[PDB]
Design a protein around this ligand. Structure first.
Ligand SMILES: [Cl-]
Ligand SMILES: [Cl-]
Ligand SMILES: [Cl-]
Ligand SMILES: [Cl-]
Ligand SMILES: [Cl-]
Ligand SMILES: [Cl-]
Ligand SMILES: [Cl-]
Ligand SMILES: [Cl-]
Ligand SMILES: [Cl-]
Lengths: 420, 425
């Protein structure tokens, strides 16, 4: 194309979910109230499940695996050189895996954080000089975790600076200072009453005294303790100096928070999704950005439809339609014939998208992606879009060197019609 | 008078150069030659230096308003406010999101705050209020990752700040430390009152002596992690750790440390004491502006000298002018080396070129040796700049990487050196 990060689809398809929602019926209920209520109840059971565990579920073999084959260093660090043998060894020794699991207690994430493959915020890149394998693909980033997320704590490093914890959707190493310990009193009170869904990214949570507590993004849920015509008060978990959780009430606007679940309509979905439009891609939520699957999970959270964290798992949600063996144009035709706008996920290995309906005769999809795989002059590349966009099923059609003769469409295996 | 055959074979492994075999990566070797237990300054002079270190460190708590004028706060938001460079997706910064940073910064109200704080966890001063990066040219040598140009400097926990502004949403503060100012996440700062500051500045300070020193309460609660360059009040060695309460003010939690982890400041200035601390840094990866809580050339030297109470400013060029400066810029390379050998004071002399600064350690096999954390050797292949990356704290000659292919320059870092600075000033 002409300029960086552009393809013709971004002019053909409006980067505005409202256009597709108008066509779908902006105020149409995509699920009946009772069924959406059931879905929301399930969402809450999944979210708080770590608080009912009595031990961590991850076997030590899986905890040990990322420390390397015979513990040897993996890949490249932040200096674009192979990970230092001594510093790598020190990560493993401090992990104290001979004692795993050494902890069994319940907590809550008090600030946006991450689950890491090993207990460091320093990165690992498999191959800095190869397209798709250098920065920003920090392979130690398993997933971002939003503030307010219940965790079960199963292990700590010897120095106590890192914990190995389990959320409803993933497990990994997390900085200890991002977790507050919760007791029965706290948990009971926290789960009683209604919850609110955060409706805008980068929503600052400040106490009535002006103290800044944390920032919340779409996908975040907090207890709702009051609501007026334009205001909503939420309870924000905060870590006290002694390590336990307290709650601080925070006043937000009705533009920033609503009682969960928000009604599931294309118009309501478009309003939330448009807030993500153009957001940079972050592998496993690096930089508090989003990737293909965290985009979809966070988009559906305010409506109470639970999705797992990874793309391949999300594809197994709802009602599957296999399309793997079809010719590319037959695949697009089947998506068009059977896909349910705003409620269907389109899946290929390593990528997942939301189907929005037909736009000017082509299937349209919302997704946050990295790049189109290319080869030019005999060298592998990526044509990077790197952000949340609306495209066709073949966004890379115009890109020179596109490795997929039939694009992403050609690689698609199935559609997943929500909910299950 | 035949010039040297240019090197064409790369060193046997990535990140390696011949100097790393010629020079022991172990500061004790150079310390033992210098006199490991020999005191490098008279006591009273070191005491005066340490008193100055403390004066400077606590200066923000003596301010009544922030000293940074609004024009300096506004400038990094771009020429006519237009986006700068590339973001974490390696594409030009988004116009809308860029504008949102400026409009949320509420510069029309600057300075909106006037209060004193302390940094409770290792943090950073940023050019603009985001932890997302800016790269000037992702595809170009020295201009892509990991050179996040929004990273002004790391700030270690326990640092006094004066708070002069906040974003409209209160999530970011504009603050001034003793050595730098910039945007910092609000939750990394706890508010301090007169009573706190008085108790806090009273009594003795301890210097942390080991990187990655985990600070945990007696109850087992993890508080934060402290590195070399960190100083905290002394109550083994019980340090008073500042912690942010839910109401935003600082409290202190005592943390019991070993004599290996903390000592009363200042530690006596000897080559052996410097060698022990610097050996803790050896091999540590390079991070521009302290990215990842790593160190760069100048934060390396500042943090190394902190336990001894020798204040260094944050920027390399400023550190060069902190000591007695000897200009060597007009000398040819061999005469420069001879001058460093003749006038340089081992373990007390900084060697400066534009964009890099090192510590002179004395002579090793007839060559000036130096300790430094560097990124790369400048190379060129087919017209295009490259870098042969060492990217970590090393000991080398003044001309490391003459064995690197594509390094056409005969004179190395030495050739670019402008002067030496003999501490203390
Ligand atoms: Cl409608
Ligand atoms: Cl790439
Ligand atoms: Cl899940
Ligand atoms: Cl249409
Ligand atoms: Cl494509
Ligand atoms: Cl001695
Ligand atoms: Cl570079
Ligand atoms: Cl300074
Ligand atoms: Cl160089």
């Amino acid at each position: 194309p002409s300029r960086e990060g552009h393809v013709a689809d971004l002019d053909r398809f409006p980067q505005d979910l409202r256009v597709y929602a108008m066509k779908a019926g902006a105020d149409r209920q995509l699920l009946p109230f009772t069924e959406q209520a059931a879905q929301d109840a399930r969402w809450n059971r999944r979210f708080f499940a770590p608080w009912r565990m009595t031990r961590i579920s991850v076997p030590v073999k899986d905890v040990a695996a990322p420390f390397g084959t015979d513990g040897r260093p993996r890949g490249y660090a932040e200096n674009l050189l192979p990970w230092d043998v001594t510093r790598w060894g020190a990560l493993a020794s401090g992990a104290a895996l001979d004692l795993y699991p050494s902890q069994a207690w319940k907590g809550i994430v008090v600030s946006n954080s991450a689950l890491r493959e090993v207990p460091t915020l320093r990165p690992m890149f498999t191959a800095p000089t190869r397209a798709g394998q250098g920065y920003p693909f920090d392979m130690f980033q398993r997933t971002a975790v939003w503030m307010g997320t219940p965790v079960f704590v199963g292990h700590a490093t010897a120095d106590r600076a890192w914990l190995y914890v389990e959320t409803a959707f993933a497990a990994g190493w997390m900085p200890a200072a991002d977790v507050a310990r919760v007791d029965d009193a706290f948990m009971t009170r926290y789960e009683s009453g209604s919850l609110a869904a955060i409706l805008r990214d980068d929503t600052s949570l400040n106490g009535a005294d002006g103290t800044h507590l944390a920032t919340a993004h779409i996908g975040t849920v907090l207890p709702l303790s009051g609501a007026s015509q334009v205001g909503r008060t939420v309870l924000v978990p905060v870590r006290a100096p002694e390590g336990h959780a307290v709650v601080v009430p925070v006043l937000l606007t009705s533009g920033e928070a609503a009682q969960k679940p928000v009604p599931l309509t294309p118009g309501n979905m478009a309003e939330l999704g448009n807030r993500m439009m153009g957001q940079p891609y972050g592998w496993g939520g690096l930089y508090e950005d989003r990737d293909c699957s965290s985009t979809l999970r966070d988009l559906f959270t305010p409506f109470g439809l639970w999705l797992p964290r990874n793309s391949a798992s999300q594809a197994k949600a709802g009602r599957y339609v296999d399309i793997a063996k079809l010719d590319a144009d037959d695949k697009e035709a089947r998506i068009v014939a059977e896909g349910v706008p705003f409620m269907t996920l389109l899946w290929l290995r390593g990528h997942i998208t939301l189907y929005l309906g037909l736009h000017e005769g082509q299937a349209a999809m919302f997704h946050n992606m990295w790049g189109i795989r290319t080869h030019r002059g005999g060298v592998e590349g990526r044509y990077v879009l790197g952000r949340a966009v609306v495209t066709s099923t073949r966004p890379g059609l115009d890109v020179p060197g596109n490795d997929n003769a039939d694009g992403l469409l050609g690689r698609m295996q199935g559609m997943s019609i929500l909910p299950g």
